[PDB]
Symmetry: C2
Subunit: 170 residues, 2 copies
């Protein structure tokens, strides 16, 4: 239901990133508060159904598109939000992880060991950046309950680079 209305709001751009790469732009969703609320409601409903008796401590969002809906979802759930950023952006002591090359970081003091988290991002394509975020979560000695994405490019089979379960809305 919501997923369908959200799918319709997406705009496709052929060869945008680069030749061959078809891009799925979810930005129009945020331009409309009604559509944005539906996106948040859809993820919240999924997490309540998937983890009925497991408390989620933090939503961990990937820079920068994961930042567009991650914090809002965290607030809707009454939980904290922590970002995974491109290296060099976060101040203080950080754990690092590499996607063979792109480097990512997370602040060491952001999440206590034993915390249960959900990693979110807009699109899972190759899955490389999400995989790196998983490693960062592992270093914090936290538990990765699931990855939640808005869209998934099946032909790239990015889900195969990820250990924890994956849920994709559209």
């Amino acid at each position: 239901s919501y997923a369908q209305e959200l799918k319709l709001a997406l705009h496709q751009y052929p060869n945008f990133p680069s030749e061959g790469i078809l891009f799925e732009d979810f930005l129009p969703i945020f331009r409309n508060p009604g559509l944005f609320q539906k996106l948040i409601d859809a993820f919240k409903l999924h997490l309540e159904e998937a983890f009925p008796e497991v408390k989620i401590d933090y939503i961990v969002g990937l820079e920068s598109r994961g930042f567009l809906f991650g914090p809002t979802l965290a607030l809707a759930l009454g939980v904290g939000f922590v970002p995974v950023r491109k290296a060099g952006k976060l101040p203080g002591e950080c754990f690092k992880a590499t996607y063979e090359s792109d480097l990512f970081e997370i602040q060491k003091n952001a999440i206590p060991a034993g915390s249960n988290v959900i990693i979110v991002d807009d699109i899972i394509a190759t899955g490389g950046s999400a995989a790196a975020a998983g490693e960062l979560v592992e270093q914090l000695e936290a538990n990765l309950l699931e990855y939640n994405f808005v869209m998934e490019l099946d032909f790239l089979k990015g889900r195969s680079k990820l250990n924890a379960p994956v849920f994709t809305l559209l």
Copy 2:
């Protein structure tokens, strides 16, 4: 009141960006939903007091820290959110603006002419990136009611590079 509790949650990092540059990290605010809600409430209260009879059409947030609270504030206000991104990130036709060098873009079809908007970001330092966002808003033929920031580094006098009024929470 809220501002005080928010100020206390900030973490300072000397010479982080680079030598001399003192960094103000607001990320701890997002780790606590109660603090995050207060940040959103504070901006909402400000905008309701400053623009009681002027409808805000969009919150325009700067990449990437402006993405952390901008969308959530937009939803709290019942308005749309549109991002200003580092060049090369947005798909489709974009307006461009340069901060003499860093280039920024905004999608041409994101905001209708005549719209009233608020530009938001976490920190205003030199004001260069915010100034560029202002130019993008001008090209969309939209009205810039105000810039809203979480923090301001007064010694850099970034506010002097900005035309529209500025409100800084802390």
